[PDB]
């Protein structure tokens, strides 16, 4: 990627996956790869987008 | 016969007959209690923003 920006649409600290973050990116190649959070701050739903 | 309560009533009431009742007396205020179930609360991202 290059020049990617993350905004939080929904944010509710519920027990399920209750938060929506829409990452506005600009990619050189169009292909799937993996997202991850290193901390224990958030737990992502899917492994790749 | 001093005139009826239809013409002399304070706050602009409207006295009627067959049940003895007054109408539309603009006085006081009605409080309200809403016990709303949790199903009606739609999430944020299902509405425009």
Swiss-Prot record, chain A:
Q: Where in the cell is it found?
A: Virion membrane; Host cell membrane
What is the recorded membrane topology of this protein? Single-pass type I membrane protein
Please outline how this chain is modified post-translation: N-glycosylated.
Q: What does this protein do?
A: Class II viral fusion protein. Fusion activity is inactive as long as E1 is bound to E2 in mature virion. After virus attachment to cell receptor LDLRAD3 and endocytosis, acidification of the endosome induce dissociation of E1/E2 heterodimer and concomitant trimerization of the E1 subunits. This E1 trimer is fusion active, and promotes release of viral nucleocapsid in cytoplasm after endosome and viral membrane fusion. Efficient fusion requires the presence of cholesterol and sphingolipid in the target membrane.
Q: How does it assemble?
A: Interacts with spike glycoprotein E2. The precursor of protein E3/E2 and E1 form a heterodimer shortly after synthesis. Processing of the precursor of protein E3/E2 into E2 and E3 results in a heterodimer of the spike glycoproteins E2 and E1. Spike at virion surface are constituted of three E2-E1 heterodimers. After target cell attachment and endocytosis, E1 change conformation to form homotrimers. Interacts with 6K protein. Interacts (via fusion peptide loop) with host LDLRAD3 (via domain LDL-receptor class A 1); this interaction mediates viral entry to the host cell.
Protein name in UniProt: Spike glycoprotein E1
Write the span of the intact protein that is present.
1108 to 1156 of 1254
